[PDB]
């Protein structure tokens, strides 16, 4: 009929508050029709046809549902707070009972794997009442909501011990030590794993009075609070939610990238292969790949080969070779922006995030329609009109970008595809190929040049802006989207209070105190991170320290002009905050 | 580092090639060390080398890591999670209105951030999608949010100047009213009763939407949600239900932080794991065919 | 003791005839690269002593007598696969290719493609059947000789992957 839910009944607008699930339904109406159906079925059975009940459902779903695809978020202290010796204590308060793990982890613990699954962490799981280190063994009891579990670590005799609500948990035998013996290694830091719809609280014991069971257990034993003598609070790190693009590791168990140097007759190539395809533990999820450096469009849009045309042109070209034996329907090719953080197991070009801003005049006429999207890619399967594979050359999708006009057109097997994307001025486009591995050899990055189109290295590197020879400098490298990254919780958050002043005045939001942070902007990646996060990225920290040293050196010995120039890069507020 | 005579031999072409090494190969700290040694040797500073390194490296701002102070930006959202799907009983037209009580223009050196509009959630989960929980990112910075700061339309860190009567940044005693049409993707803004010549079209409607404002220091604004909670300064456009009508019966409409972590004591801090997707928020009748 | 599956009970479909078309051609093509690798040059004279052979010439232009008995092993293979009773479904792409219907030889390697667990097991057991057929033949020459035995007469599972290799690779290439 077209009716929709409405808190107030209105026939003309087709409003009905009854359009809700039966559990959320009104009690009076539900009991009315409920007793009606009780009476009907009870009369049905009293009629003599005593129909038997169906198979009673005793199954349990075990609550597999979760936000996106993340089953747990790992919370840990900063790596710099690792303890090498000593004897330390901290408490974990379980707000809601469920699948949570608390224990001690090494600085090398990955934020995506289960806490205690590998050797990086030593954790206690109370929901299953089972320890976790390179496997699981039964230990302790199960906690309820509100129970507080204390974690005790002794780095002298290499012993760890857990206490639940005060009593010491013990092993299958009478031994009280959670883990008999380990090695110091690189140190230990507190860590907790929180499951779906799980709430917990960690108390590092900055105030000894906050620790609730420390007096009965831990104080006389000689254990010390983790924050026994810290003037400022511990910076706590959590698992990052948004996937990011990072360079493919050389030791990756699935992905392998090899660099093929370009000969006189062959363009330089970057080839991506699947190590463990046709073997166990292969990954069939769509793997997202990206080149490190982007192509930047012009600030303002305009409104054999000729060497002059190749000097005055701005169109850049790269292509991909879909390896014969790899299904083109599982591979997408094109350009993506820096904002592309959508990691989905099933990727389709229909669900690419997009918006269309259409600025108009006061008369209502559409002055301009601008389509904005993070992903501008095409599918190889729909482009492969001949079908199947050719050994002489695989499906060769080629991408050309006109930095002066923002026109993204795709060339395939010498014929131009119908799909075309027009991008905004100054947009930074990253070459990217999304593919699901159906073969050991999936695809490779061809960096050649088609007729009258400037090669990609010119648009990538300003030094080679005028070099027609294709190049693959070591800076450019394939990056894959992954969830294995930590994140730094801010020490201080903005203070805002919310309260509904009155029915007339509505809800009020009030923030009056200023708070600032310094952001470190990576130029090539179009990214930005807090400078205080560099406590865990050693390479960036070292490079920025040496950049500061160079900044000091160029203005050293009273180079006043250089100092005035540097005042723009580093200003008074930045200096005074640092 | 050893021979002062080397510095005189080093020329403009060599000092450019050294920087081109950093450009082509990548971030390498020993190249920066070599450049430092070029500037000063044995306590003697070379003005030419210091000038060349500066004028050939600094102005580009493409190799060295840039740094800047950014004001923290937080976001408040109501409890309502309005969305559109087939066979679902939710109204496709919605309206809410914002009242700016006071806004200091420059609490700090950087201008204050005040953007209002709608944001979406990836899937049916209650987490806002595509945006970092903390930082200098607000409404209109990620591609899942749609904002209006008074002069520009914000979506995915891209701002386009929108024509409006008496163009100005949002100041004291400015009234912003937002309209969202989920039947045909449409987000419309209405400033002080005058129509903003701006338009959001053909955006993804798979996820759940919600009103949201991104603010910085020195912001004091009020949500006029209509009905019991508020009263609209201007009449809603025809057929546009007020946003307070989307609250579930047993649930109480409250304004909370868009993100799950806020300012509080570290030991009292409630650590939240992943939350179950709110697919039950959308109601769709599923009768078994007989 | 092996037992090959019965083959006379079943008949060939024209849709499978279409499949053996261009498949016998690709097999002839790869065997033609084998001939050029071990030294054969295209020559109408039957100079098989001096590495001259006219077989390096496209399969359709070849004589139908040569085309026959060459497709015969494919016929027994398809009898074997259908005798299992397995169902076969044509895709839209494979039907558009049927609708669509001097040169350097193109042969495509297809070890790049990978089968699933199910097709793996099916190929393994049908390779079992082909090894059983070969063991039956070797058994007939065994009774013709009247004595002796063959080391590979032991069942296919009792064999090892190295001697299995030709039968496996044939299995996955035909099913791929």
UniProtKB/Swiss-Prot annotation, chain A:
Channel activity is modulated by phosphorylation. Phosphorylation is increased in failing heart, leading to calcium leaks and increased cytoplasmic Ca(2+) levels. Residues 12-209, 304-452 form the B30.2/SPRY domain. Detected in heart muscle (at protein level). Heart muscle, brain (cerebellum and hippocampus) and placenta. It is found in: Sarcoplasmic reticulum membrane. Induction: By TGFB1. Homotetramer. Can also form heterotetramers with RYR1 and RYR3. Interacts with FKBP1A and FKBP1B; these interactions may stabilize the channel in its closed state and prevent Ca(2+) leaks. Interacts with CALM and S100A1; these interactions regulate channel activity. Identified in a complex composed of RYR2, FKBP1B, PKA catalytic subunit, PRKAR2A, AKAP6, and the protein phosphatases PP2A and PP1. Interacts directly with FKBP1B, PKA, PP1 and PP2A. Interacts with SELENON. In cardiac muscles, identified in a complex, composed of FSD2, CMYA5 and RYR2. It is linked to Ventricular tachycardia, catecholaminergic polymorphic, 1, with or without atrial dysfunction and/or dilated cardiomyopathy: An arrhythmogenic disorder characterized by stress-induced, bidirectional ventricular tachycardia that may degenerate into cardiac arrest and cause sudden death. Patients present with recurrent syncope, seizures, or sudden death after physical activity or emotional stress. CPVT1 inheritance is autosomal dominant. Ventricular arrhythmias due to cardiac ryanodine receptor calcium release deficiency syndrome: An autosomal dominant arrhythmogenic disorder characterized by syncope, cardiac arrest and/or sudden unexpected death, often in association with physical exertion or acute emotional stress. Patients who survive manifest polymorphic ventricular tachycardia and ventricular fibrillation. Unlike typical catecholaminergic ventricular tachycardia, arrhythmias are not reproducible on exercise stress testing or adrenaline challenge. Cytosolic calcium-activated calcium channel that mediates the release of Ca(2+) from the sarcoplasmic reticulum into the cytosol and thereby plays a key role in triggering cardiac muscle contraction. Aberrant channel activation can lead to cardiac arrhythmia. In cardiac myocytes, calcium release is triggered by increased Ca(2+) cytosolic levels due to activation of the L-type calcium channel CACNA1C. The calcium channel activity is modulated by formation of heterotetramers with RYR3. Required for cellular calcium ion homeostasis. Required for embryonic heart development. The calcium release channel activity resides in the C-terminal region while the remaining part of the protein resides in the cytoplasm. Belongs to the ryanodine receptor (TC 1.A.3.1) family. RYR2 subfamily. This is Ryanodine receptor 2. The chain holds residues 1014 to 1688 of 4967 of the full protein.
